[PDB]
């Protein structure tokens, strides 16, 4: 199942959202993934198109990245997999 | 309109599985040279392009860098993804 914030962003265009309007990335993960260069969704979608969708990979990239858990990185892929299902 | 009929099909849809070739300055020659890099579809590019915060400069240069795209491919498929973007993201 999901959050209201997966639907919310599965929903429409992201534009320039912030990185935290992903499902799964909350304040600490964001405050990491801005550090890192990662400031706005589109840029976390864009690694996730240049890993090519892969599951295990963009998981795995994400923890490293930004000490995502298991949950966060579940949630923060779906939302961009449902999100790319309908915009890409 | 002074864009390529190639540039004015991919911005006017959402680019799904579309092959890199079908990006504006994507010929032959620099499709298959991204294709061997693992740039297969237009959305890898796509993610590049993302992961470069839609800079101008650093794009159109990792382009050269990985195709030898020359200047006008480099800004013919640079203003092709971000009117994309601009219509869809």
Known sequence: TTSQ???DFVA??????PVGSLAGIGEVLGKKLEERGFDKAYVVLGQFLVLKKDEDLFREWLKD?????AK???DCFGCLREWCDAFL
Do not use: I, L, V
Not at 12 to 17: A, D, F, L, R, S
Not at 65 to 69: E, L, P
């Open 5 to 7: 914030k997966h639907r």
């Open 12 to 17: 429409e265009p992201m534009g320039e959202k």
């Open 65 to 69: 990245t930004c000490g995502a858990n």
């Open 72 to 74: 966060q990185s579940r």
